Symmetry: D3
Subunit: 271 residues, 6 copies
């Protein structure tokens, strides 16, 4: 298993830039061509929500074209910036396993050594996350019927506060219900989240829980300041690889930077 | 608890650049000034090994001046590029708890809600890591006395293969020794490493294990290509913060980038 | 009093770039988000003319949306690139004090310790400036009835030649009539101008007279060369602050640059 | 008269960088070459203080070589970072009119239509400025003999508070002494300063008073924040040109930017 | 004779970027303004094919506007990305000598000391080049009836393999027929080509044969790898100047770079 | 045969920059590492003169270390900035075939299908080139013994005027001597030169004659302007490859740029 995992693409409609000046559509089309150009090709690409910025049909048209140009199977989940009905109408053809009920988009993948569970934590009318009664139950069904095979969950909202003053009030409001599932099920060992536009990681019991950077704009972690900052610090994604018994995640920079060169002992320490 | 955690500084002697073209001394001095300019000021700065590039006295003179200019208590450990004896002669005044014995540099910090354990995985005459039995028994004694109080370990070399074709052969060669300790002690919940010049994370039982990006040059993760690449992709550090009973790690970019701006709902979705 | 003062925005219509390659709309939307992100917030933003590039309705639509997203009261005046009727139709809702006569857009503001006078020096069918009979008179009425309270004028065109070979032939043609007002009225102590896309300043009697940089593209000052140059040297704006008896103007860079860091005596002069 | 006016060079010793990361010596050498490459060649170059950063002999050796490579007559004055004795030993051969006495460095230039007065506001043992009575009486005598011929003064420290929270406490402490002279002498019409690393301008009676940007690092203007910030925002200098009876100052960017191109009406507004 | 020679503009339609992220329309409009800003003005501009990316009418509309804003006579030829009929419909007004038969676009220019021959090597339905029976014959007529006057050919496709693994299979398939003409006609001494997006040159008999960089994106030369790479390495064009008996071609960079400065002996080698 | 061909390195002494601001030593060390990192590895590296900037021993110490770190056989020739005696003392161990006599440095290489002839056009006491009669008769003997086997010559100075107003007066002063040899020997088909810091190519009979870009700073081609300009436009080198019976030269960018990506027909022309 090799997965490329990007998040928080925030597509805008065809003539438009995010906030009027951040060319998210171009930045995302660059990211897509970077992923298709990889020498070590992923089995699938994951996009953990906030696919469009305004939940508008014209943004979904752009998202469909650009994400549809990925030469990889896609696993797509919504964030609070998404519209459920439009997300399903436009993007389900790119991720058929979502289903055809816009209120219950979920899928389990077990092509790999680790089971993958994709859920919708987005809630209409709020920036906060919510795990529906039926999502919590289906999650518990996957883990209860899943025996000893490890599981990883992909969801938009972090299921616990991370001390981030901007982002904590809008984490998954009943995320403690998912933490109850990690306490009860030793097989649940990874939870990967968007939302935060930041690489921030913690462990709860046997589960490593991490948010991802966005593909374009980032949000800095502030502990005290609640001012709603964003910046254009370097974008990146996470590669997830199965290495024997170990699920390893490594950061793959999506910036354009000098290099690489080759290490040489004589050049490193001249005499 | 707030910690700033950098590694793999690779200081050169005064007037030299890494490989003749990477100005590591300037770049690290920029980093030191970034860390002194932080609004949310850390309680301490950790530097997780490969402080100098060639283990030369004149490189340690530069490291001592530049790291000595941090306005914080420092916790310093060696990497394979370090020389144990010179590291102690030059850097022990910056980190008095290392001690008087270059072959047994390690210390425990009990100031915070999680205990911090700093160890030396570097071995003279090789790039590979090695955990001596005296390090392992010191760790056993620390973890046993510690009881239910959580513990994090800082070491240069990752204690398990991460699937990185360049870095795996030179990981901690007897890392099983540390893995056996995480199995023994449910208290041991973080291991943070340098060496890989890359943010790559994994979980072994209750322990999150992560390598850090370098402060200057990075090394890309390749699974099958063995070429010793390095590049100048974006540098960062990890901030470690105790948030309730959660240890949270977030990436803090060391690059100079545009922003921040403030999010505004009218600018986000114009009508 | 704190005023942010930008000039020469040169908005283009929605799909378009200035000269086909300079993204003025994005550059201006960045500038707008920079102004809304200021820690020390201005009481008002001034835009001293050339708001659009071609005097076209579709450019005014863009200008209205982007300038309308400023979270500040606005004082807007036209330049030679503007159309009076369209400027009034589209932008008067953002600056109601202009009036409803497109040929006589003028306003006095005296919320502050210094009176502010905003005038239209633009003339239909020419790049040169002209002060209408009625503008000169209204200006003299403000100063004559204004007693000892200092006054500052904002106008698009400089009221005197500055030795700039490109820009002098197209300064305010009867600007000497305004200089007659500074000779006669000691209270008139500031005249700020756009047009030149350059910070150039001089004093005439008690009046400091200055042109501003543009928000996007600049024009270099040449004394001999009349070739119509523009470049993309760094953009900036002027902040105007009342500091006791003193009106002080400082340049605020609108570029994205490294920093800031904090000055430290030990780092400045190492021993 | 054409003058190029730079300041706050902050030269370091050979092989050192400011704060360990700002290559001031390279950046100033770039500036010197930019000034030698000017198409409209100045009659002289003014450098308004803080020539070196630490007042060290080896910094003056660098300053002497780099400033000595300007293909122009120089007028040099000290700032607080300078050492008076060493400044005279090293730099007087570049500016012979300073004299033989390190405590009374000043000179008048009568080559041009406006007389130029260069003075020393630096005081040993402090960052604050000080105008000695011998400086004030020399100025009185210069301004009295000068009669109706306009005069500009060059000094390191601004003679009044500008509202800059970082810079105000270290302005010219007894600047009232100079303000009293502008009240006395209607002839005194410009005062140009370094120290603030910022273009900030004001008017006191008939005098325009301006501080200049630095050639390398800048300091942002904060009204309420006291933190000693510096950044690497765009560097520039001021060109001073006599234009008829107008002294005009224009900003000349020292950055490397795209352009220039030529304005073309068809490209400006396509049909 | 001075000719500016650009190639492989790859215009997209008005809202669009190449591959979604490369702004070819803006990059080309910058290139056009660079050419109109030249101090040493060419007699004509040559564009050696791939004018548009998709052979679509809306791309030709953009090409017509941007290339039409060049203040120079134009010689335009198609590449494999062009549509013959649309190329003629939209661009023949900019290069009337093409004719009015879209299948036989060719022209000879002999205003200069060297005859210029412009041909269409593009073939409907393939990326490969083909010289039509009638093109080969007309070429031979020009050279046979042209006596001792030197000739240069401009064509899109290289008439011989260059060892480039990506580009060789799609060179001019019967290019050996043109090589037969260089063997037979000593007056044919230059063949300049697009297609390769790379400066690559060789000689065959008395003929120098060269491909050009693109104005925007480039393709790297690989000898073994057939992966279809493109990158954004620096763009440039070729200037062609007649210097006595010599046709000289020099590379003119279209990037924005620091400089120029003036060489000075004392600065070059300090003492 | 694959050759990497760089020139005009202009190495400075340790800790110095060219003109005080161009870090030639770092930039060339970057280049050396780029050449060691090549996927298609050259058989040898040619450096065509102006190895050092001032002909100083300490510059040759830097050149020896940095060029000595190339993992390839080197062919080195001097330029006018070189000192013949010091060039031989320091660089002959890197290029043993130069010999023992500083006044007659030259060699022939017969390893490849085309013979390579390396000569010294530098003349003590001038910038101009000079071909000694002993060089010419050595060349005659080489070309006569060589018979039908093609030959390329590497020399620092171009053997004919290229119309470059800065560079023509300091070309090879007696270059007619070499032109006479191309007339004599149809076998002599390439002459490659440094000196001009520019890719400029021409053809004389069966010979392609080209100057190369520098590895760091470039010089623009001006036909009428005599000012000694240099800039920091993009650096490159030439790769020389034998492809069947064709010698092909391609430009290899030494800049750090975005890419590569892979071409995809759906992304190229979306529907
Ligand atoms: Fe988001
Ligand atoms: Fe979100
Ligand atoms: Fe390292
Ligand atoms: Fe290491
Ligand atoms: Fe304007
Ligand atoms: Fe204007
Ligand atoms: Fe200063
Ligand atoms: Fe100062
Ligand atoms: Fe092409
Ligand atoms: Fe093509
Ligand atoms: Fe050279
Ligand atoms: Fe040379």
């Amino acid at each position: 298993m090799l997965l490329a995992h990007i998040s928080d693409t925030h597509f805008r409609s065809r003539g438009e830039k995010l906030y009027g000046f951040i060319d998210v559509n171009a930045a995302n089309a660059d990211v897509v061509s970077q992923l298709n150009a990889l020498r070590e090709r992923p089995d699938a690409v994951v996009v953990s929500g906030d696919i469009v910025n305004c939940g508008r049909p014209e943004e979904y048209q752009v998202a469909r074209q650009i994400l549809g140009s990925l030469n990889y199977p896609l696993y797509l989940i919504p964030g609070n910036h998404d519209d459920k009905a439009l997300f399903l109408e436009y993007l389900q053809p790119l991720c058929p396993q979502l289903g055809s009920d816009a209120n219950n988009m979920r899928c389990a993948v077990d092509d790999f050594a680790t089971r993958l569970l994709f859920i919708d934590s987005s809630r209409a009318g709020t920036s906060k996350g919510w795990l529906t009664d039926e999502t919590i139950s289906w999650l518990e069904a996957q883990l209860f019927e899943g025996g000893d095979k490890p599981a990883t969950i992909f969801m938009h909202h972090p299921p616990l506060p991370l001390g981030n003053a901007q982002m904590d009030p809008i984490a998954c409001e009943n995320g403690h219900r998912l933490l109850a599932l990690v306490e009860r099920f030793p097989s649940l060992t990874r939870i990967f989240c968007g939302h935060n536009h930041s690489l921030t990681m913690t462990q709860y019991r046997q589960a490593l829980i991490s948010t991802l950077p966005g593909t374009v704009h980032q949000v800095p972690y502030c502990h005290a300041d609640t001012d709603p900052y964003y910046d254009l610090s370097p974008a990146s994604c996470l590669m997830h690889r199965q290495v024997g018994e170990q699920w390893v995640s490594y950061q793959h920079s999506l910036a354009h930077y000098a290099g690489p060169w080759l290490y040489d002992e004589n050049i490193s320490c001249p005499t």
